[PDB]
Structure formats: C-alpha cells, structure tokens
Amino acid sequence: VQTQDFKTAVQPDTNTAQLIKTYSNPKQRGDK
C-alpha cells in the first residue's frame, strides 16, 4: 500500500488505515 504524499486532517495515513486498506483498497495510488 502506497503512502500518501502529504497528510491531511480528513485523511491521516495512520498504520491502522494502511492495514485496513490491504483488503479494502489495495491498489490505491498515493499521488495527490
């Protein structure tokens, strides 16, 4: 899972979110 380019208040790229994204949205680009 790619990390986001920058962190936002709405979308903080936390470790828990990244773990969930493995089975929910694995192919998500971090480019903003």
Residue with tokens 């994204």: 21
Give me the resolution in angstroms, 1 decimal.
Answer: 5.7
12 token code pair: 């903080």
Residue showing tokens 């998500």: 28
How far lies 9's CA from each of 15, 16, 18, 27, in Å? Answer: 15, 16, 16, 22
Q: What is the C-alpha separation between 2 and 27, in angstroms, rounded?
A: 8
Amino acid in the structure at residue 30: G
First to last CA, the chain: 15
**Helix, strand, or coil (residue 16):** helix
Structure tokens at 32: 């903003």
CB atoms within 10 A of CB 28: 11
> Cβ contacts of residue 3 below 8 Å, gap of 6+?
13, 18, 30
Structure-solving method: cryo-EM
Angstrom distance (rounded) from CA 3 to CA 29? 8
Place of tokens 């986001």: 4
